[PDB]
């Protein structure tokens, strides 16, 4: 049961480079460990212009969700630190937006939730609630 009219969402786009690593979220699904590589490229469109306070207001008033264009990469298998296979997904946002998000905890939290949601629906995943920023590794895998 719910009554809200809007919710933040991934606007899936075709990845277009040049991409580069950003940061990596470790989490689990119902099936195993998952790494989400939040990457960025200038050729991913930005979200519509909005200030942090305008966006919080729209959330409070249920007048919009944050709609972030992002590519939702296909899975690639990678080894974790213990030598076990895990699934990684590369999710790219716009570079200007990424630079803004570096200076905002609020925008970062939105991106993480939205990337999780996009991958969950695209790949039929049930990510478990806990997740962690990888401190010493911006990207799980190569490139
Ligand atoms: Na809402």
Author numbering: 2 to 144
According to the publication:
Engineered small non-antibody protein scaffolds are a promising alternative to antibodies and are especially attractive for use in protein therapeutics and diagnostics. We proved the applicability of this systematic procedure by selecting a monomeric single-domain human protein with a fold different from previously known scaffolds. The newly developed scaffold, called ProBi (Protein Binder), contains two independently mutable surface patches. We demonstrated its functionality by training it as a binder against human interleukin-10, a medically important cytokine.
To generate ProBi-based binders to IL-10, we created a DNA library by randomization of 10 amino acids on one of the ProBi surface patches and used the ribosome display technique to screen for ProBi variants with the highest affinity. The random mutagenesis of these 10 positions gave rise to the maximal diversity of more than 1012 variants, which agreed with the potential diversity suitable for ribosome display. After the fourth selection round of ribosome display, we selected eight random colonies for two-step purification and crystallization trials. We used commercial screens for preliminary crystallization trials and then manually optimized the conditions to get better diffracting crystals. We started the crystallization with seven variants (G14, G21, H25, H33, J61, J70, and J93). We observed a crystallization process of six variants, and only the G21 did not result in any crystal form in our tested screens. Four variants created crystals with low diffraction quality (ranging 6 to 8 Å). Crystallization of the J61 variant resulted in crystals diffracting up to a high resolution (1.2 Å). The fold remains stable even after nine mutations at the selected positions. Because the affinity of the J61 variant to IL-10 was only in the micromolar range we continued in the effort to develop higher affinity binders.
